[PDB]
Amino acid sequence: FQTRAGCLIGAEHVNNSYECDIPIGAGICASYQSIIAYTMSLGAENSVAYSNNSIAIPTNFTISVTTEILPVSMTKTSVDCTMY
């Protein structure tokens, strides 16, 4: 297969489109089924029902708990010249 990133051997080009897991480049990437290369999809598409006299209001709710992890420090090291 020939693409803007280069030439790819060992994969089959398809006409579908799914999420991207192994990014190849130029907007294409590959996944395992065999191995298939395809054009990545940016997500599901919906058309919100706009009108000039209509709204939507929620009736229920949920409570969610999420995580985020941050590094704050690294190991303290020292080096002596003459020994090194």
């Binding site: 000039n52 209509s54 209001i57 409570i63 985020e68 941050l70 590094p71």
Partner: protein, 208 residues
């Protein structure tokens, strides 16, 4: 408990530091163009007036490697300091108070957060509110009554086909329209979208 690789960032930091140390210590086994890699051999094979050149080559090579290592350490330390400042701001704003800036801590409307200690970092648990189960309704921006225009004090006008209640903007809770949750401004001739209806008041029924 089960899923692994959930702490990729800390592992990446540790791996970077360990690999930098490993390559630094492995660089001690390079000739750098000299006749050997150990000082004792060149000392015990050649007379010093000619071995000093090889010693100089080893010295300059090792010094250059040390310089590169120190520069890389400085870069990484600067980045880590940036991350630590971000973490301090998050811990001050999302743990000691309820934050209003959208998406700063949590994907939704922020409620609270809890910290947990990690080997070289911190973990925040964010509690957020998410609406669900929405419904369609018809809407009007004002109500014309007795020639005047009424706007909601806080909420929005809706109707389930008829009856035109007022609600709050984030949770369906219809209520009858009274002169207590609305205010008047001008006549109903300039606004684009007003609808005819009635606005009840309690003083008249209380009168009799």
């Amino acid at each position: 408990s089960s899923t692994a690789s959930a702490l990729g960032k800390l592992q990446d930091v540790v791996n970077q530091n360990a690999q930098a140390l490993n390559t630094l210590v492995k660089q001690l086994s390079s000739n750098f163009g000299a006749i050997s890699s150990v000082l004792n051999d060149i000392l015990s094979r050649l007379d010093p007036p000619e071995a000093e050149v090889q010693i100089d080559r080893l010295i300059t090579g090792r010094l250059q490697s040390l310089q590169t290592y120190v520069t890389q350490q400085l870069i990484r330390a600067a980045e880590i300091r940036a991350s630590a400042n971000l973490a301090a701001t998050k811990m001050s704003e999302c743990v000691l108070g309820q934050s209003k800036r959208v998406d700063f801590c949590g994907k939704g409307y922020h409620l609270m957060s809890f910290p947990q200690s990690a080997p070289h970092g911190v973990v925040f648990l964010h509690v957020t509110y998410v609406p669900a189960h929405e419904k369609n309704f018809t809407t009007a921006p004002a109500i014309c009554h007795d020639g005047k225009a009424h706007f909601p004090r806080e909420g929005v006008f809706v109707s389930n086909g008829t009856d035109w209640f007022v609600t709050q903007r984030n949770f369906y809770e219809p209520q009858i329209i009274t002169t207590d949750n609305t205010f008047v401004s001008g006549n109903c001739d300039v606004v684009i979208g007003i609808v005819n209806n009635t606005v009840y008041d309690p003083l008249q029924p209380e009168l009799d």
